[PDB]
Symmetry: D2
């Protein structure tokens, strides 16, 4: 009856932590302790950073072609071991097997995009700016980088963070979430088996202690974070204070706009899948719906569609949404629903008291739909991050756009309509960096960049894409001048260069 | 005997400030008061920000073509008034007419690069990522931007900051240096004459009060700064604290590596021009020279070449370098030279006690050359920002590269040599974002980007170039699905999209 | 009185031609001979090519910055002389003053896009492909280039051809249409006034001898043509035969698809303006209209709207469309209308017998609308190139797309509809390189490229845009290796480079 | 023992040809018949083109992601089966096992570059060019493509041609060289095993009938060729005559410039490896060497180094260069050497009468070095394409540059020197699209495009790189306009769009 311990990854060797404080890993479907992740000690984190620094020079001096082949073999291994990572994700995080497979597939797509380093790391040149003078620039790695991933995406966020940084020539110190480290450990093992030199990738687990270590250590040049607003802002501030570039994606309150001329059944199915998919534990979940004009008549049909969802453990066949991450999240969602009810909101569907056969101890919360919600309610201002859908009613699209713009969180939004003018007006007037036309989850594919907004993102450059490549890299502009008279030594030049 | 007052540019009108606190403008060649710049009051700065916000919507909704026409006409007007701004800069800042004309010409080049907005604001697209699904991204402005420029470039840095934001569709709240506001006033007048809508560009003047206002007001999205390390770090921290993206080019310490096989006379001329040009008051001036191997023998010739420079007022014919900005700068430079002398340094040429005919009251300091300097000396660690050149000697290029890497400031560096292998080795091993091969001032043209480094820059994105355009813009990714069955309404779709 | 003779532009000097063969220039509104253009003799063309070759080296060695300044001043001069060029175009070609101003404005936009040569001429680099090995490429000019422009655009197409090629460093041998050379002469004079070195631009005139000379001379590297199918194919073949890269925009047949849900009045206005604008002599005019489904009911309203057009000389106030280029074009259009009538087609509006007050000698042809046209009719297969609109009726959008794909000409097409799904389906299934959604004239702006198609273009690279820049330039890839051991000569290297 | 017959790859099935004409495959090391390749009949080529056309729609409609995964798995299979293809190449073509491995490795690098289709096919967009108007473009496939590869690269050039067109969405009809079809058969089998739909790739064999079919079939949109000048020009003409874009790489006479300050031993080793590597049967081999100034003294050392090469069969250990392709090539090389001797040339090393132990019947020709060669000699003007090195001598670098510029073939060139000024001067003044600084084989990596020149290349767009994607694709520019008034139907619009 010995609980397995999550191994660290320092210097290319899976080593057990020598710390005293341990964090228990619970299965959200049964709340049973399945493992223990340790809090990395000062000495262990120091050794990890030292290994990253020692591997930086050799890994950077290595040609980009070798890193490309390494990442290609890593993507191959991911393809080979996709179902194992999906099962580990369903076990730790609790999301449905299909959700874990989609997560691993999006991570694989991000890796495959990163495999284009040959074309992404290309610089620029300008010959003959002046007589016998040239100008060109190079893209070079920054140094030791760090990453902090959330619990809702055990595999997608690490594959966003560390592959891009490593392939560009950096060495990454990945700090995965303390609730789902198994996916990150499997990814690190697959990377080590793909030819990655020892010390290039290192992993440490721990609570705010590790975050402070990452944000305070001077040898770390870049920090990537995805998670809540509080932790994201704290990390961004603590990083910028020491001079580290930090890109942090924070909570979101994406709004869905349903126009009267939109496809009824398809729009309702999309709303359901996006609001209750993965138990709503996504930074891109369409947790808010705005029914414009005659769209108010679709509330009964939306509730009927939401009633057809199956709430069961992730590993069970036919499951739609899994349980929540921890009982604390369930209590928070229940308290937020209670507050919404106390503020005058009407609940059309209530799944708080749902009970699953064989999983009575799991953190399950059924689909919840709240109507008559106003912008001044707590359930609207606070990020539910669960299987709850708040619905607002407006008479014109102008009011919907105004409501969307007034909300601080703008990670993404979607408008459903069959009229091109309406979609164009919405996409042009809405102050959201990720707009979706008939698409509820407008997650930009890897070749593009995850375009955060005012409140749902901090920093300057995005996570992946060309933005991602530019973030983990720095430009070295070289102004070269080779006078023609120096090609054949005849006499020294006594004239300073003049345009 | 009334001293002219520098008027504020708020709402497209040159208005005199009602503030009771005034700062006198002294001519550095004679220390005669030639003008006064007021500290903008709270109400005036609020009105300026309100005008910027009111102009933002209309200016952004304006087609990029009209902004390109505006930028082209502004470049034309600058060309028509180049020598006027040059004389105004020579009067206020004190730099020789040649340096002022060069500053204005480089700012004109920056503006002309900005005129390429049409080819730089183009987004990306991806057709048919999924059946009847498309993906694309748009570049859009941020909002009200701000800029804080130093005194050593009354025109170049303002034309780095505000034209880029203007052409991209953003409204700019520019804060020029209190010591040289006339150039910015002339530039704003020429811009208003080019057809820029009233209120699009607003200018305020003041001491740390205005900086705090800019860094604290929430309606400001981006801040650009160039200057010292203390003020740069302060502004960057105060901005990032409030969620604003900030790019701050801080102090620098450039090193000039002289190899034995380099062109003797040309290398010496370049070193002299870059160390004493513009009175050494430049962030890219080669205040440090590293004589590698047999380059030690060139110290007498370097001193002889430096002795041929003419120190006179900026408006006198044949003036090579003008006086310093203020007597405080002269006192600081003299105290730094004294400290260097105390620490064992050897002064080969001393210009502290120089006296100019007819300008005995000016802040003139002749060419100064210090030798036997070590990395641990005050004159080496502190940014002189004046007509002083500290020389170091090394037996091998490896030691020079090590010295350059240990130095925190890496704004730019130059290596002089006729061997391609040596230049390549230096450019590859040196940790400087701007390397120069036989080029003493490796300032990248506006088409490239000013690639800052570890200490000479704080932020993620550079000032001008593609990075400059990206800094003042944000990406809006749009994912649209247009299922074929919706083109010919026959029956509603009851199937959710599946990739 | 004497008739003015068009001067040749050789060596920067407007010289009178010694040719014995002359072509009269007739005013299309009164058929009065307003000028004569000579056929350049063999010696004159040889001298022009010699001047181009002599100017090539100096103009190419000239830094890109100087060429950018020259082109900016040329754009300024165009802005200063826009109305004069428009008046000259209205006098020679006959198009309305507004049409000539739009032509000159589009040419000015093309020039302003060309101003971005600094960012467009950028290359690529890949540092450290192997140990001590670098790789980069450069964009360089081709050499002497030539251009053959049609009559329908005396200014737009010349400004597409010669400015783009010249700013990249090439020397252009322009060849304008023998019917409208005055606009090209004025443009060349303005360019010479902008500071362009003499001999960089040379211009000759001729019908077939000049074309054969341009296609046969070996010193010409690139040829740009716009016009009919016969001449385009002939020039393309004669150029490819001699190893010259040739881009030839040929005739077109645009189809306007009108869906039932489109904006009735706006769609009709756009159709009228695009079918009868500029006397329908444009290569992008919607000479064909496809009424899908219930769109058949709009034929009476379309005819009524077309009846409101004013047919008068180009210089008269309120003139909507001017006369044709020559009596031969009028006879051709009349014979094509007669053939269409003889093939079963129905004419709703007949303007062949139109007579204008005071301009009875002008080649005026009123708006003509043909209905019941089938794909097998002569008027449908032949390019009318006049104020004639053939209307077809389809039962579904699939039939319209099939008809559009079956037509060999695909220069451009437009679909009018308020449903986004329909527009997406059309743009995806239509085999046309330039599609328009509610836009009748989908002429891409300068920053994009004029994307030819199956029959309306012969070649690989487009005219303007990034493709336009690439067409008049060639890549020079430089694989440079500088071993570190050569930086410090100690012993010769006896090992061949190995990956 | 019966001779194995090469199979045709039509409709995704390896089938034997019913043609009565067969071409024997001879092992160049023993001239023994190892296989036969049939000349595809008219019916078989028609069926192949029909399969390509039938596969084009489904393959193009397939998302780019699926094609990316297909190319990734194909690169994986190539990595797995690299040694088998290398052995097949050594057997058929005769090149050393190391040469075949390098061929397959470069082809694999090209495939990996093609895997970046997600980033290369991305279009452009310019939002808000006019009120409620957008503009964007899409990269789309052309159609059925064809390829004709030479014998000296059984795998490298096929992997240049067909993978690029495949991943872009085009169906390819690859015609490999009749002398080395086994490598192409293995590559097609591996591709079919990688998930490529049946009929997407088709292969036919022949000498002239297949070429005429490819150049005359109207369903073929693009043709890619590499080989001799005669065949390249013939194919380019026959293609452009029918309206097909053709890119044809042709013979080369690359020159190697050796400066006195260059690394003696390393330069000589590089010259030997590049002139005699792969038996000189390469389009980038340095068959010409220019000894500038004091470089004349290195002829004895060059001959001594060339004498150390081992001439043996490709599959034998320690082999440096294999035998020629056919006895006709050996006879041609010997006759060219004889003609050069008759014209006054001096042969320092003669390998014509070389005899290999155990391979007396093979087409082996030892290293040959010719000196005192002039530009007007036959051996200089004619492409030897064998293990022959003609050496020229010049007193200054200007003379060498003039000699290189006067030569028509400019596929590539290399200059050896330790002085940056000389290298820059050469790279700037030499009229060659591929310049090498201390690199004998300046073959651009797949990320860069092949940049052949005046006589060594015909066409507009280059083979691979971004140019490769641009060649096998076409841009579809879409000018979209959605007026805001149409989003909320209230009244029809009676105003035509106006800027």
């Amino acid at each position: 009856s010995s609980v397995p311990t999550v191994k660290l990854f320092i210097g290319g060797k899976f080593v057990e932590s020598k710390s005293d404080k341990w964090i228990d890993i619970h299965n959200p479907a049964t709340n049973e302790v399945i493992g223990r992740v340790p809090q990395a000690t000062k000495a262990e984190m120091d050794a990890a950073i030292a290994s990253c620094k020692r591997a930086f020079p050799a890994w950077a001096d290595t040609s980009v072609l070798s890193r490309q082949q390494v990442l290609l073999r890593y993507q191959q291994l991911i393809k080979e071991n996709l179902k194992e990572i999906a099962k580990l994700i369903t076990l730790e995080q609790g999301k449905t097997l299909a959700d874990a497979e989609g997560d691993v597939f999006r991570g694989l797509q991000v890796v495959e995009h990163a495999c284009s380093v040959t074309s992404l790391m290309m610089g620029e040149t300008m010959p003959s700016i002046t007589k016998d003078m040239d100008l060109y620039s190079y893209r070079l790695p920054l140094g030791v980088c760090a990453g902090i991933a959330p619990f809702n995406f055990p595999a997608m966020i690490p594959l966003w963070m560390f592959p891009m940084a490593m392939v560009c020539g950096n060495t990454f110190l990945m700090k995965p979430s303390e609730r789902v480290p198994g996916a990150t450990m499997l990814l690190a093992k697959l990377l080590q088996d793909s030819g990655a030199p020892d010390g290039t990738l290192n992993i440490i687990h721990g609570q705010h202690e590790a975050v402070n270590f990452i944000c305070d250590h001077p040898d770390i040049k870049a920090i990537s974070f995805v998670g809540s607003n509080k932790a994201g802002e704290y990390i961004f501030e603590r990083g910028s204070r020491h001079g580290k570039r930090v890109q942090a994606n924070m909570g979101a309150k994406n709004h869905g706009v349903v126009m009267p001329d939109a496809n009824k059944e398809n729009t309702l199915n999309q709303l359901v899948g996006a609001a209750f998919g993965a138990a709503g534990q996504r930074c891109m979940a369409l947790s808010t719906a705005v029914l414009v004009g005659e769209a108010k008549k679709w509330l009964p049909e939306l509730v009927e569609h939401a009633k057809n969802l199956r709430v069961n453990a992730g590993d069970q066949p036919g499951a739609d949404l899994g349980p929540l991450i921890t009982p604390q999240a369930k209590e928070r969602v229940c308290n937020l629903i209670d507050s919404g009810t106390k503020e005058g909101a009407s609940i059309l569907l209530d799944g708080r008291k749902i009970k699953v056969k064989g999983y009575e101890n799991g953190n399950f919360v059924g689909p919840t739909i709240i109507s008559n919600v106003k912008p001044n309610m707590t359930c609207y201002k606070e990020e539910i991050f669960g299987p709850v859908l708040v619905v607002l009613e407006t008479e014109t699209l102008d009011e919907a756009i105004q409501i969307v713009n007034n909300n601080p969180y703008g990670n993404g939004t979607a408008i459903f309509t069959t009229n091109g003018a309406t979609a164009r007006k919405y996409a042009h007037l809405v102050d959201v960096g990720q707009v979706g036309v008939n698409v509820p989850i407008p997650v930009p594919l890897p070749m593009f960049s995850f375009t955060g907004s005012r409140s749902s993102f901090r920093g300057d450059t995005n996570f992946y894409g060309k933005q991602g490549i530019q973030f983990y890299t720095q430009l070295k502009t070289i102004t070269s001048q080779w006078k023609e008279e120096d090609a054949t030594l005849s006499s020294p030049a006594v004239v300073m260069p003049t345009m």
